[PDB]
RNA sequence: CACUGGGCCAGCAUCAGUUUUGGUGGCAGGAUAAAUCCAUAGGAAUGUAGCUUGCCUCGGUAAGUAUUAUAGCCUGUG
RNA sequence: GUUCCUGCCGAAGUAGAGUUAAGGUGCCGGAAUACACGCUCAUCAGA
């Protein structure tokens, strides 16, 4: 294995196509999600890059902003969240 | 009466089943039994309804729908009330028929669709319905249970008849959609149930003469489907169609669509009576209308029908002889599509009657120079007719050679490739039956076709000259046509040319039509096979 | 729904994506009014000009170094 | 957490199970439903009967499919995709008969519906509305239960073997030294 | 072929505005918190320690005084 | 009957970020199928 990231699901838009809601595995609380803020998101061949902005709700869903908005057909699509830029 | 079983399958009294020699009950005796059958029907079925009302959850929730619900919800609730116990709930059956009769087209259609589903769920018998006076074993000794059943059968027959009335009034509705839906329901009932088949067929075939061409076409299609589903009613359907086409007030639209429908019927080698009906009907209509553009189409259809039915028809040849001159009058008519079929009929009659046939061959040799033939869609029928005629005339070597020469003359100035390949294939085959035709190549036009732009035409001509016939499939119309060439040439047919790999295809195996494609692909490499 | 809040910024208003304000031109004399304002303005030949005049306007515009918004119009299609 | 999740239909409510499954499908998870004939609905038998009627597909699986499609925006591209992701079956057809099947606690009837409240079994409803296959499925289910009893015996033997193996690993040193040191 | 300056893009650093989220430091007030803790006399029961009586499965059982004893507790109160 | 588009004054706006009222947190739909109490499932249950 060579995985240095966690593959997460893209849920939906903020309801605003600019903001996207990302569900990340093993994150039940906003406190757990606070770690992932600022990390780079990559939807994968072509790749679109973005970043995690802030938490969303009590379930651990987070907000995300990409350089170009997702096409809205990727709700439930697999998305990667890397560890850099690390704050630890 | 039990509710767990369809009320036809409920066992009747035994006395019904061995009483065929019973004296004819007087009308009063039938009336009293009919009344006694009635009172027993609106008897305990009420007690069943009283038992139904005991379930307060069931009664209240449905009564709310039957009182306050929408029309769709009420239609559903009434339909179920009939499915659960059709015999007991005459009130809901009457209610359902009452929705069919309103002024609201959408709801009336919905209610009638619900009734159609109820009828076509097997609720109606495999057999037809019987009136109370016509029931078997109708006697004074019959029990209340069977007597109520017979009364309900009479009531349901009247129900079906009033439903047919509602169909008839709605079938003439101005809105095209309403008429089409009513037609669909009528033909569904006619196909799947036997009750009032004559009246249902009468309405359906009556809609052939509808003002709207769409309704007429739908009726014709549904009638042809009905014939295919039940070949045995083919004679009845044909008789019904004849009953309208021959009316004094038939109207050109109605008779035209009726002749189309009769033409599209299918005939078998044991149906001489039906074919003998159809040929006589066509001739009667032909004399009716002969005695122009609108006329040309009707004559085209009538000639098509007579040609279709001339095989399978055991009619004396003298009948056709009466119209023979008239048929020739068509051959010089304005619409060449009529002349093709007229020539077909003339050839068939001449062959079967063994007439001298010089005049027919004269008219064919003439019609080869008809300019309208070049732009005629029916060139394939003309090709087949030419082949059959020339095959039948093998003895007159000079005449057939003259046709071959003129055929090539006409072909030199045509644009339709499929027709030209057709003539070349015919000439190749006529050479086999008549080898003396090859003498013309040794004793001039063929040089042009050898230099024809179309590769397939060139290959056919080369084969005819060389005599190499084994590599020729019979040319098929719809192939070599321009739209087909575009479909290949755009490389996207999908029931593609690029998908097949042309690097490895045997050169002789490759059809002449696609040779240029092959070259490009074997030059392109790259996206040769995808 | 249109309203004033949608109004575009003044510095960017009336600007093509090339960054040149479009100015209608009828003849050479009107072209020459845009001699130095090549950065700020680009010429646009009017619809009613004949083909013979358009080539002259294009030649003079090239000499002046002024961008033409619709060249090859009525000398080519689209 | 798995490529595919097999959910048993027994003892579940149609609405809650359908909502949960629809939510999972919209997130891309693939779910297949089996043994839907024995699904449950709250209320009385008549009320559900007339509800399915005023709708009037007779099979229980189709009723569940409608209930779930009511959640998803099927007319959109996304809803259609969620719908092909779904699978529904009456009884367990192959090959899922050889795979263990999870339970959704949120839709369980035992945890949701209060004792002494009328409910309805979807199989009875489907049979009453005209689904003439409840009989064949029951015999297949009985055979499946016999096979499952055999599998349970095999699993008990496997658990005994696992206990023996765990005992064997216990008397090895390296694991004990590792646990004391860390982890 | 090598280096350097401009422009586009991606990242980082150091700043500015706006807010969001933590961790942690210092200080004032209260009845200078009130508790607790250690003291502390008096009092009680949800009555310990024991004694006594009846009967006793020969170790537990039943309740009369019993205010601390082989448990503890509440008030005043430093 | 209505009265091209935009703006303005007045009885009785566009975009980004954050906060918040009214509301809402089963799914469509963004938010706990969170907690803690008292109730009620009625043939008019109750949205
Ligand atoms: Mg113009
Ligand atoms: Mg800052
Ligand atoms: Mg302090
Ligand atoms: Mg202090
Ligand atoms: Mg104290
Ligand atoms: Mg003190
Ligand atoms: Mg704002």
SS3 per-residue string spanning chain A? CCCCEEEEEEEEECCCCCEEEEECCCCCCHHHHHHHCCCEEEECCCCEEEEEEEEECCCCEEEEEECCCCCCCCCCCEEEEECCCCCC
Return the biggest CA–CA distance within chain A: 38
| Residues touching nucleic chain F (CB < 7 Å) | A 11-16, 18-19, 21, 53-54, 56-59, 61; B 56-57, 60; C 1-7; D 15-16, 19-20, 22-23, 26, 70-73, 106-107, 113-114, 116-117
Distance between CA atoms of residues B332 and B121, nearest Å: 57
What is the CA A31 to C1' E9 distance in angstroms? 35
With an 8 Å Cβ cutoff, are D46 and B55 in contact? yes
Sole residue written with tokens 């000079």: B398
**Edge-to-edge, what's the strand order for the sheet holding D87-88?**
D4-8, D30-34, D87-88
**Closest to B162 in 3D by CA, of B94, B249, B63, B250:** B94
* Secondary structure (3-state) at C42: strand
Omega of the bond leading into A85 within 30 degrees of 0 (cis): yes
Written as six digits, the tokens of B447 are: 């040089």
Distance between CA atoms of residues B165 and D48, nearest Å: 36
Distance between CA atoms of residues B361 and B393, nearest Å: 9
Beta strands D30-34 and D4-8, pairing class:
parallel
The answer to whether the CB of B298 falls within 8 A of the CB of B259 is yes
The answer to whether the CB of D14 falls within 8 A of the CB of D41 is yes
D26 in contact with chain A, both atoms CB, cutoff 8 A = yes
A14 in contact with chain D, both atoms CB, cutoff 8 A = no
Written as six digits, the tokens of B301 are: 């259809």
DSSP letter for D87, please. E
What distance in Å separates residue B480's CA from the closest CA in chain D? 41
The answer to whether the CB of B497 falls within 8 A of the CB of B517 is yes
Rounded (10°) CA dihedral D158, D160, D162, D166: 180
* Secondary structure (3-state) at B13: coil
Distance between CA atoms of residues D127 and D146, nearest Å: 25
> Which positions in strand E are less than 7 Å from the protein's CB atoms?
10-12, 21
Q: What are φ and ψ of residue A42, in 5° steps?
A: -140, 110
Length of chain A: 88
Q: Which residues of A touch D25 (CB under 8 A)?
A: 76
| Residue B194: strand pairing partners | none
What is the CA B426 to C1' E64 distance in angstroms? 139
Interface test with B, best of D44, D46, D54 (most B CBs within 10 A): D54
Any idea which nucleotide's C1' is nearest the CA of A15? F30
Contacts (Cβ under 8 Å, ≥6 apart) of B403: B364, B365, B368, B386, B390
* Residue of chain D whose Cα is closest to the Cα of B61: D47
Q: Which helix (H) or strand (E) holds D4?
A: strand D4-8
**Closest to A41 in 3D by CA, of A10, A14, A75:** A10
Distances (CA, A) of B284 to B188, B259, B306, D88, D143: 32, 12, 11, 63, 72
CA of C42 to the centre of ligand 1 (A): 19
With an 8 Å Cβ cutoff, are A9 and D27 in contact? yes
Distance between CA atoms of residues C78 and D176, nearest Å: 83
| Residue A50: strand pairing partners | A41, A66
Chain breaks of chain D after residues with C–N above 2.5 Å: 56
**This structure's resolution (angstroms)?**
4.0
DSSP letter for B266, please. -
Cα-to-chain-centroid distance, residue C14: 12
CA of B353 to the centre of ligand 3 (A): 132
The answer to whether the CB of A81 falls within 8 A of the CB of A22 is yes
Contacts (Cβ under 8 Å, ≥6 apart) of B475: B418, B421, B422, B424, B425, B456, B460
Any idea which nucleotide's C1' is nearest the CA of D13? F26
Beta strands A19-23 and A40-43, pairing class:
unpaired
**Domain total for chain A?**
1
Written as six digits, the tokens of B238 are: 């044909």
Obtained via which technique? cryo-EM
| Residue D32: strand pairing partners | D6, D87
Q: What is the DSSP string of D10-46?
A: TTBBHHHHHHHHHHHHHTT-EEEEE-GGG-EEES-HH
Distance between CA atoms of residues B210 and B17, nearest Å: 47
Distance between CA atoms of residues B198 and B229, nearest Å: 16
Distance between CA atoms of residues B139 and B16, nearest Å: 8
> In chain D, what are the domain boundaries?
1-133, 134-183
* Secondary structure (3-state) at B83: helix
Beta strands A78-82 and A61-66, pairing class:
unpaired
Distances (CA, A) of B203 to B109, B160, B171: 17, 15, 8
**Closest to B206 in 3D by CA, of B187, B227, B225:** B187
Return the biggest CA–CA distance within chain B: 105
* Secondary structure (3-state) at C11: coil
The answer to whether the CB of B76 falls within 8 A of the CB of D56 is yes
Written as six digits, the tokens of B327 are: 């048929």
Any idea which nucleotide's C1' is nearest the CA of D26? F27
* Secondary structure (3-state) at C6: helix
The answer to whether the CB of B458 falls within 8 A of the CB of B450 is yes
The answer to whether the CB of B381 falls within 8 A of the CB of B344 is yes
The answer to whether the CB of D100 falls within 8 A of the CB of D5 is no
């Amino acid at each position: 294995s060579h995985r240095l990231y966690v593959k997460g699901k893209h849920l939906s838009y903020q309801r605003n196509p600019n903001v996207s809601l990302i569900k990340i595995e093993g994150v039940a609380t906003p406190q757990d999600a606070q770690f992932y803020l600022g990390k780079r998101i990559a939807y994968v061949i072509r790749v679109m890059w973005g970043k995690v902005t802030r938490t969303h709700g009590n379930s651990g869903v987070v907000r995300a902003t990409f350089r170009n908005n997702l096409p809205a057909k990727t709700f439930g699509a697999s998305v990667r969240i890397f560890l850099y830029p690390s704050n630890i | 009466i039990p509710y767990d079983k369809p009320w036809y399958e409920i066992p009747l009294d035994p006395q019904v089943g061995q009483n065929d020699d019973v004296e004819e009950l007087s009308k009063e005796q039938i009336e009293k039994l009919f009344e006694r059958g009635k009172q027993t029907l609106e008897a305990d079925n009420q007690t069943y309804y009283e038992e139904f009302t005991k379930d307060s959850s069931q009664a209240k929730f449905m009564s709310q729908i039957l009182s306050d619900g929408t029309l769709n919800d009420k239609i559903s609730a009434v339909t179920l009330l009939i499915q659960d116990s059709p015999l007991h709930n005459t009130k809901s059956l009457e209610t359902l028929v009452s929705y069919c009769g309103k002024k609201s087209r959408n709801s009336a259609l919905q209610s009638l669709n619900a009734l159609k589903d109820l009828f076509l769920n097997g609720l109606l018998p495999n057999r037809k319905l019987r009136y109370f006076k016509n029931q078997p074993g109708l006697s004074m000794m019959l029990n209340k249970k069977t007597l109520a059943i017979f009364y309900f059968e009479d009531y349901l027959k009247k129900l079906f008849f009033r439903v047919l009335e509602v169909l008839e009034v709605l079938s003439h509705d101005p809105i095209i959609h309403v008429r089409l839906q009513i037609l669909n329901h009528v033909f569904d009932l006619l196909t799947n149930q036997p009750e009032q088949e004559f009246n249902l067929l009468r309405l359906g075939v009556n809609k052939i003469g509808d003002i709207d061409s769409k309704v007429s076409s739908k009726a014709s299609y549904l009638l042809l489907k009905l014939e295919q589903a039940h070949p045995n009613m083919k004679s009845i359907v044909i008789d019904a169609i004849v009953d309208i086409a021959l009316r004094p007030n038939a109207d050109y639209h109605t008779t035209y669509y009726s002749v189309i429908t009769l033409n599209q019927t299918i005939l078998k080698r044991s149906e001489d009576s039906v074919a003998n009906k159809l040929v006589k009907t066509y001739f009667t209509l032909f004399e009716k209308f002969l005695i122009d553009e609108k006329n040309s189409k009707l004559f085209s259809a009538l000639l098509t029908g007579i040609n279709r039915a001339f095989p399978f028809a055991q009619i004396p040849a003298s009948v056709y002889e009466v119209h023979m001159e008239t048929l020739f009058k068509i051959t010089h008519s304005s619409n060449f599509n009529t002349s093709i079929q007229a020539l077909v009929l003339i050839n068939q009659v001449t062959v079967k009657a063994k007439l001298n046939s010089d005049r027919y061959y004269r008219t064919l040799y003439e019609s080869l120079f008809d300019p309208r033939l070049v732009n005629s869609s029916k060139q394939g029928i003309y090709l087949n007719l030419l082949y059959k005629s020339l095959k039948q005339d093998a003895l007159n070597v000079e005449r057939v050679e003259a046709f071959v020469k003129r055929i090539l003359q006409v072909c030199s100035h045509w644009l339709n490739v499929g027709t030209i390949t057709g003539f070349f294939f015919l000439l190749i085959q006529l050479a086999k039956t008549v080898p003396q035709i090859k003498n013309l190549l040794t004793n001039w036009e063929i040089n042009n076709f050898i230099n024809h732009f179309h590769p397939t035409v060139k290959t056919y001509a080369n084969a005819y000259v060389t005599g190499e016939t084994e590599q020729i499939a019979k040319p098929d119309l719809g192939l070599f046509t321009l739209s087909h060439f575009l479909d290949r040439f755009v490389y996207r047919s999908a029931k593609p040319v690029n998908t097949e790999d042309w690097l490895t295809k045997k050169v002789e195996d490759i059809k002449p039509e696609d040779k240029f494609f092959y070259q490009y692909f074997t030059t392109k490499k790259t996206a040769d096979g995808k | 729904q249109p309203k004033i809040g949608y109004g575009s910024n003044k510095k960017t208003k009336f600007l093509s994506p090339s960054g040149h304000k479009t100015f209608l031109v009828a003849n050479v004399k009107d072209l020459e009014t845009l001699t130095m304002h090549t950065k700020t303005y680009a010429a646009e030949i009017a619809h009613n000009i004949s083909a013979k005049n358009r080539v002259v306007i294009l030649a003079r515009a090239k000499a002046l170094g002024i961008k033409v918004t619709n060249p090859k119009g009525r000398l080519a299609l689209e | 957490v798995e490529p595919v999740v097999v959910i048993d239909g027994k003892g579940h409510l149609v609405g809650r199970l359908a909502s949960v499954v629809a939510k999972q499908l919209l997130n891309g998870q693939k779910i297949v439903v089996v043994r839907a004939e024995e699904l449950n609905i709250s209320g009385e038998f008549f009320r559900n009967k007339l509800k399915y009627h005023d709708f009037l597909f007779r099979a229980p699986s189709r009723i569940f499919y409608k209930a779930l499609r009511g959640m998803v925006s099927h007319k959109t591209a996304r809803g259609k995709a969620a719908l092909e992701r779904l699978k529904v079956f009456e009884g367990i057809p192959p090959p899922y008969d050889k795979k263990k099947r999870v339970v959704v606690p949120q839709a369980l009837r035992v945890l949701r519906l209060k004792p002494g409240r009328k409910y309805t079994t979807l199989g009875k409803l489907s049979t009453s509305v005209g689904w003439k296959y409840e009989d064949v499925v029951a015999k297949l289910e009985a055979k499946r239960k016999v096979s499952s009893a055999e599998y349970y015996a095999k699993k008990r033997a496997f658990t005994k073997k696992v206990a023996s193996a765990n005992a064997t690993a216990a008397e090895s040193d390296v694991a004990k030294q590792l646990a004391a040191l860390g982890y």
